[PDB]
Amino acid sequence: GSHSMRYFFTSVSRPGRGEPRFIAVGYVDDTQFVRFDSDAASQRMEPRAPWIEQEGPEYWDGETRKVKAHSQTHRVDLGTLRGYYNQSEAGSHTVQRMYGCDVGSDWRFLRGYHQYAYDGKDYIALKEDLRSWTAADMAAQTTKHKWEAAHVAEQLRAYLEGTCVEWLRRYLENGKETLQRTDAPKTHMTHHAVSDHEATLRCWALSFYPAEITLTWQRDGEDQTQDTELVETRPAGDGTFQKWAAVVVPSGQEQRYTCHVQHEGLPKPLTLRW
């Protein structure tokens, strides 16, 4: 359908002893396919999806080299940032980076991104044009000038519109059986009496993929927002996702309420009622 490939990197400094904790993960859509953890035994980029396992030794050598090198870039960064912000050597700090590309339903490039954060706040980000930088503050402005002189954006643009898209298409083909399969939500409603006068209706969506979904309540055919609760979409732990929406209603008036479920796996939205 429409698709994306993203990589996420986190480094956390350890002032008491040793080097930062480093964790990298790669995704195609909502499927994790690779990982690296500096605390793990292998010290290699590891597979996490059956369809990536077919890649040969030069793939795993190259990805391991790149991911370990990235960890050292972050190690240097943490020292430099402590200096930019005039901070002590005694505290723990965090660097985060995410980059990737989206393609359309025709598998052609739609957009690319590369974003960087220090201690959980925006630091520097590549603009949608893939040519310019957004620097949050004066420290990041210093970094911007350095990255301009090092031709960083040029390289990233080339990757995001080229390699990124090309390998995403490759993965989509190799992992067709699951990556190009949509799992429609299995839906049902439960009823929970609160008193003689009131009850909670809860609308369930289970075992769905991809994660994107919309749940809405209506009363007599109009959207209702009062007395509703909507939980964050959550992983089931088997590759799929779950979500629910609930509403409090006068006991005996349950038939007025309808739950509406929208998902890429559904040709038209579903309507549920008690």
């Binding site: 990589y7 990805e63 790149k66 991911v67 870039t73 980076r97 630091y123 960083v152 990124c164």
Partner: peptide
């Protein structure tokens, strides 16, 4: 497949 990120801040 990853990009190369060699330039520090």
């Amino acid at each position: 497949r990853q990009a190369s990120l060699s330039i520090s801040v």
